[PDB]
Write a protein that binds this DNA or RNA. Structure first.
Length: 1026
RNA sequence: AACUUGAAAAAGUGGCACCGAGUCGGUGCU
């Protein structure tokens, strides 16, 4: 029946789940293949994939290759050729002299009505297609996507969204005037950095500006890399250098680097259109002609000049090609030639405009110089359109194939290269491929029936404790800068430490300068518990738990009685204090605006629309790309028109929606317990996406992928909360889009508003949410103990390295008599011998010395091959002599929630104290979890020394506080965790890794070949082979 | 992953409801 899919995509996992119209995950009878007596199994349609990053065949296939670059280039050339040659089917000295560059022919073809040579116009168009530029901007060029001003604004907004703490605010800056100025790149960088007080070029933003200008920044000092990273936009190695950089630093900065690239493109476009003599012209080719004219004029001038003052060294400059001459520059670079010629210009007297052309990097430039491939393809399509309008009457074929050649130029399964030509670490590409084929397997499981909904969310990487100090460093820098700006010795009277600043209450206490933000008397240092946290924009309107929307006060009642932002009574008293905090750079401008919004009318309709945008729209570009890939692969049907019918709808959300859902409705997640959390996140993805999509059908263009009818906010918002709600077609007065799950909504005044127990759409009368039954369903699904976890098996390609272990039965010679005895061994195939192994295994094994090898059961065992043994314990084949743990401890959701609450004990007061009481009441859950993990370890782990040592440690440490107990149980879960054993630390005792050096047991165990979703199983009984 | 057809690019194979839940079990149907 009707169902949907949720996805939680990361660099190491792909979570998936399927929910029906009642938000239940189906269970199905799945066939089991192999040579056992078990021919069926019950499986839950929820699970997750795991895959460790590394070098593999797929990893190499996902790498950018000049080979595919060049082959699709020749393909484009072949299309254009075939066209022009079919048209044809149905001198060099003159060409060189009157066409010194292809750009000359470009411009004269754009601006000439006379008949031109067919081979020459063919060459021009072939150049157009072969060098077409990037597709980073969608649609036709307009000021909206061209102006350097707003594109710089987009870059700074992207940076601010990428941080949202310690941001940079640029409103009075004149980006067009600064960047568009015709000067040197270094001086332009200096001038731009001068206008932003906060940072310099050495910083991330300074280096991004330098890259957008055209310099060669290094990100070593910025991102703490042990290996230097040089990035040049003109270099052809920029793509792979950026890929490696993002692999080292994280994949969330791809949008930042793309925004910098777009700013550079805007700079190039503004400079190239700067010389626009005629509107109906081709600015690119025209400025190229002007550049070549400057080249020729300066060449002739220098030839004449080296003669008057000094005829000598004329050979060294023009003919030698000896060390670094101008002929050397035309023979191979720019900075090298500049360095060579700088002493010449310093020595030569009366130097002039040649110098300004040199240091402005516009002197004697070649045809294909740096910053020429960055031109967008819209310039080329407009140029071709002008060409076709010029030559429309002569050639009927170009009139016939206008749209044909346009679509050939603009058109961009080829999944591997499609994902390779992207912006991300060479692990997210593998993860996206995993996701695509997981969805393929799921839709094949459901009998080629397509889902109604596919929710997409990129799993946020957990803090690796390396970034846990980075944010502390920036917050200490911010607080010291602000406190120095003000002058109150608060840190002198009460010093703090980076770690201590992770407490939200203390951080807000210091951001409010140790003084109450609403009431004019000093706050008590040693009485922080009695204080409360207030949200400037109430959660009933906006879900924002960051520092930007948090303040600290003695009582929430001081904000006033109204449900909007605080009244003007306290504003009049504390305007000076708020202004001082703004000038200290401790409080951001957006925070100040949301503070003073009452004086500007209060919360407005445009603000509510913007809050919907912030809570509902996804900005991360790779998410749009993966949604595009999935939608294109999913919906392939059209109608008589040229519009795509959307039978399957691709749904995109943020990580904050599901996180807040879990926090609000006690579907808590602890990822280290087992690998079920990816699947649970996918399930919540599907549930939330389906519920939102059925509750609000007119918000498609906000988050759903596709070309829908754009909508406005007037039809979305009711005039009054009570007098208009439940009486009109307006969906919501409250901009917190998460409302319809809640049965009770707390307001800013305290009135707890109630909403119907069952949720339905007014327009179609379709019930969407029954708050009791659906909640019980979600709890049951999260408590379901069978979730499919699969670790990807891969062959290693590229102390020898073993490609894969091989399982073989053969004969060996034992003893002096050389009597043949039956033998069963685990043999490892190194990378070097792998090719010969596939070439001739029988001969290869005979050479190694095995006799009477049966070709039938020579079994290929990749890495992490799963083995199941007595009592269902599982082991994975790590190497030819080591094994890894292969089981999952399915802990009930009651202990899962207990572990979450106990671990986050310290991190509304009523629900907080209720949760604290719930934690304190259930002390026996600690011993229950200990018993559960002990029995699971006896069942599957079989490391008696580790079990008894850790049990002794727990018995010694029984009376310690519950928070520490729960955290150390979380650490203890390492013993039962999937994969390779690793040492873990309890309160004081360290339990070393129990390596599975013995590997003879898997020779008689049961091998299981898992599919990517884990639903299709092939279980082979190895003991029967012999 | 595994299985089958192919030199290769590449194509194909895993029934449906209910009651349940310790890594899935049980019942009806086919």
């Amino acid at each position: 029946k009707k169902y949907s899919i949720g996805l939680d995509i990361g660099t190491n996992s792909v979570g998936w789940a399927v929910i029906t119209d009642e938000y239940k995950v189906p269970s199905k009878k799945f066939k089991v293949l192999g040579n056992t007596d078990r021919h069926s199994i019950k499986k839950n349609l929820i699970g997750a994939l795991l895959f460790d990053s590394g070098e593999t065949a797929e990893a190499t296939r996902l790498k950018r290759t000049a080979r595919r670059r060049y082959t699709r280039r020749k393909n484009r050339i072949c299309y254009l050729q075939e066209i022009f040659s079919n048209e044809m089917a149905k001198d060099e000295v003159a060409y060189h002299e009157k066409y010194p560059t292809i750009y000359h022919l470009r411009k004269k073809l754009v601006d000439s009505t006379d008949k031109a040579d067919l081979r020459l116009i063919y060459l021009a168009l072939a150049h157009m297609i072969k060098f077409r530029g990037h597709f980073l901007i969608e649609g036709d060029l307009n000021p909206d996507n061209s102006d350097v001003d707003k594109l710089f604004i987009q870059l700074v907004q992207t940076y601010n969204q990428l941080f949202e703490e310690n941001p940079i605010n640029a409103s009075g800056v004149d980006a067009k005037a600064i960047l568009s100025a015709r000067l040197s790149k270094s001086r332009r960088l200096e001038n731009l950095i001068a206008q932003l007080p906060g940072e310099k070029k050495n910083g991330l933003f300074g280096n991004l500006i330098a890259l957008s200008l055209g310099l060669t920044p290094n990100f070593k000092s910025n991102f703490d890399l042990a290996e230097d990273a040089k990035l040049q936009l003109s270099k052809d190695t920029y793509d792979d250098d950026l890929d490696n950089l993002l692999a080292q630093i994280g994949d969330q900065y791809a949008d930042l680097f793309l925004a910098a690239k777009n700013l550079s493109d805007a700079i190039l476009l503004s400079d190239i259109l700067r010389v626009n003599t005629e509107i109906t012209k081709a600015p690119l080719s025209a400025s190229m002609i002007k550049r070549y004219d400057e080249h020729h004029q300066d060449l002739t001038l220098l030839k004449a000049l080296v003669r008057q003052q000094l005829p000598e060294k004329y050979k060294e400059i023009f003919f030698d090609q000896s060390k670094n001459g101008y002929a050397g520059y035309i023979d191979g670079s720019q900075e090298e030639f500049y360095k060579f010629i700088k002493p010449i210009l310093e020595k030569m007297d009366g130097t002039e405009e040649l110098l300004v052309k040199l240091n402005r990097e516009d002197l004697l430039r070649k045809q294909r110089t740096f910053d020429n491939g960055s031109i967008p393809h819209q310039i080329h399509l407009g140029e071709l359109h002008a060409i076709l309008r010029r030559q429309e009457d002569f050639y009927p074929f170009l009139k016939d194939n206008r749209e044909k050649i346009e679509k050939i130029l603009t058109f961009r399964d080829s999944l591997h290269e499609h994902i390779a030509n992207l912006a991300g670490s060479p692990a997210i590409k593998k993860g996206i491929l995993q996701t695509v084929k997981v969805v393929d397997e799921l839709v094949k499981v459901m009998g080629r029936h397509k889902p109604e909904n596919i929710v997409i969310e990129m799993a946020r990487e957990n803090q690796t404790t390396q970034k846990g100090q980075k944010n502390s460093r920036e917050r200490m820098k911010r607080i010291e800068e602000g406190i120095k700006e003000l002058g109150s010795q608060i840190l002198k009277e009460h010093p703090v430490e980076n770690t201590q600043l992770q407490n939200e209450k203390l951080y807000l206490y210091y951001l409010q300068n140790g003084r109450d933000m609403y009431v004019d008397q000093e706050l008590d240092i040693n009485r922080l518990s009695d204080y409360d946290v207030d949200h400037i924009v109430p959660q009933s309107f906006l879900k924002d738990d960051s520092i930007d929307n948090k303040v600290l006060t003695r009582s929430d009642k001081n904000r006033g009685k109204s449900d909007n932002v605080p009244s003007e009574e306290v504003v009049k008293k504390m305007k000076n204090y708020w202004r001082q905090l703004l000038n200290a750079k401790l409080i951001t401008q957006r925070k100040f605006d949301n503070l003073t919004k009452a004086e500007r009318g209060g919360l407005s309709e445009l603000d509510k629309a913007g809050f919907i945008k912030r809570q509902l729209v996804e900005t991360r570009q790779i998410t749009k790309h993966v949604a595009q890939i999935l939608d294109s692969r999913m919906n392939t049907k059209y109608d008589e028109n040229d519009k795509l019918i959307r039978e399957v709808k691709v749904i995109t959300l943020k990580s904050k929606l599901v996180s807040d859902f879990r926090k609000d409705f006690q579907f808590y997640k602890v990822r280290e317990i087992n690998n079920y959390h990816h699947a649970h996140d996918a399930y919540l993805n599907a549930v939330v996406g389906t519920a939102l999509i059925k509750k609000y059908p007119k918000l498609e263009s906000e988050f759903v992928y596709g070309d829908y009818k754009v909508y406005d906010v007037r039809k979305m918002i009711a005039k009054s909360e009570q007098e208009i709600g439940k009486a009109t077609a307006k969906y919501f007065f409250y901009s917190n889009i998460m409302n319809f799950f809640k049965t009770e909504i707390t307001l800013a005044n305290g009135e707890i508003r109630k909403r119907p127990l069952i949720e339905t759409n007014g327009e179609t009368g379709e019930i969407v949410w029954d708050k009791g039954r659906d909640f019980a369903t979600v709890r049951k699904v999260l408590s379901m103990p069978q979730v499919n976890i699969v670790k990807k098996t891969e062959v290693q390609t590229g102390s020898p390295t073993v490609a894969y272990s091989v399982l073989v039965v053969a004969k060996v010679e034992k003893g002096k008599s050389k009597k043949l005895k039956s033998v069963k061994e685990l043999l490892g195939i190194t990378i070097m011998e792998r090719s010969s192994f596939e070439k001739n295994p029988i001969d290869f094994l005979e050479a190694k010395g095995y006799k009477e090898v049966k070709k039938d059961l020579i079994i290929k065992l990749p890495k992490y091959s799963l083995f199941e043994l007595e009592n269902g314990r599982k082991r994975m084949l790590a190497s030819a002599g080591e094994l890894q743990k292969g089981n999952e401890l399915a802990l009930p959701s009651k202990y899962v929630n207990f572990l979450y609450l106990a671990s986050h004990y310290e991190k509304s007061p009523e629900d907080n104290e209720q949760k604290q009481l719930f934690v304190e009441q259930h002390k026996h859950y600690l011993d229950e979890i200990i018993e559960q993990i002990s029995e699971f370890s006896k069942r599957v782990i079989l490391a008696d020394a580790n079990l008894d040592k850790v049990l002794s440690a727990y018995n010694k440490h029984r009376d310690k506080p519950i928070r520490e107990q729960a955290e150390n149980i979380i650490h203890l879960f390492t013993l039962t965790n999937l994969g390779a054993p690793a040492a873990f630390k309890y309160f004081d005792t360290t339990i070393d890794r129990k390596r599975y050096t013995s590997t003879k047991e898997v020779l008689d165990a049961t091998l299981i070949h898992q599919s990517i979703t884990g639903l299709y199983e092939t279980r082979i009984d190895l003991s029967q082979l012999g």
